[PDB]
């Protein structure tokens, strides 16, 4: 029932990586 989605306080990230208040999709594990 839950999303299980996330957010980072930087920027709204469903998911990914969050750096220096921006979320990126890439190169990252």
Not at 8 to 14: A, D, F, R, Y
């Given at each position: 029932?839950?999303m299980?989605?996330?957010?980072?306080?930087?920027?709204?990230?469903?998911?990914?990586?969050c750096?220096?208040?921006?979320?990126?999709?890439?190169?990252?594990?």
């Open positions: 029932g839950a299980g989605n996330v957010n980072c306080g930087g920027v709204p990230c469903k998911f990914g990586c750096r220096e208040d921006r979320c990126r999709e890439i190169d990252c594990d």
